Structure formats: structure tokens, C-alpha cells
Amino acid sequence: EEKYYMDADLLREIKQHLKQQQEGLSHLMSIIKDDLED
């Protein structure tokens, strides 16, 4: 079972990056979605 030790700090930073990226994309969609469609 291949697995990787990490501290809570590193896992938190990974989680935060994914969350913030999604939030950013959703923010952009709120501007550009209606242009992609018309």
C-alpha cells in the first residue's frame, strides 16, 4: 500500500489551493457564461 506521510499544514495548503481555484473559476463563470452561450 503505497502512501505518503504529510503534516496537516501541507494537506491544508493543498485543500486551500483546490478550493480557491474552484471559487475563482466559478467567479469567472458568473461573468463569461452568458457570452460562451450567446
Q: Tell me the three cell numbers of residue 4.
A: 505518503
CA 21/CA 13 separation, integer angstroms: 12
Identify the helix (H) or strand (E) that includes residue 34. helix 8-37
Whole-angstrom distance, CA of residue 30 vs CA of residue 38: 14
- How many residues are given for the chain? 38
Q: Is 37 in the site for its own copies (CB under 8 A)?
A: no
Write out the residues near Ca ion by the rule CB under 5 A. 7, 34-35, 38
CB of 38 to its own copies, least distance (A): 9
Using CB under 8 A as the binding rule, the residues of this chain from 14 to 33 that contact its own copies are: 14-15, 17-18, 20-22, 24-25, 27-29, 31-32
- Site residues (CB under 8 A) for its own copies? 1-11, 13-15, 17-18, 20-22, 24-25, 27-29, 31-32, 35-36
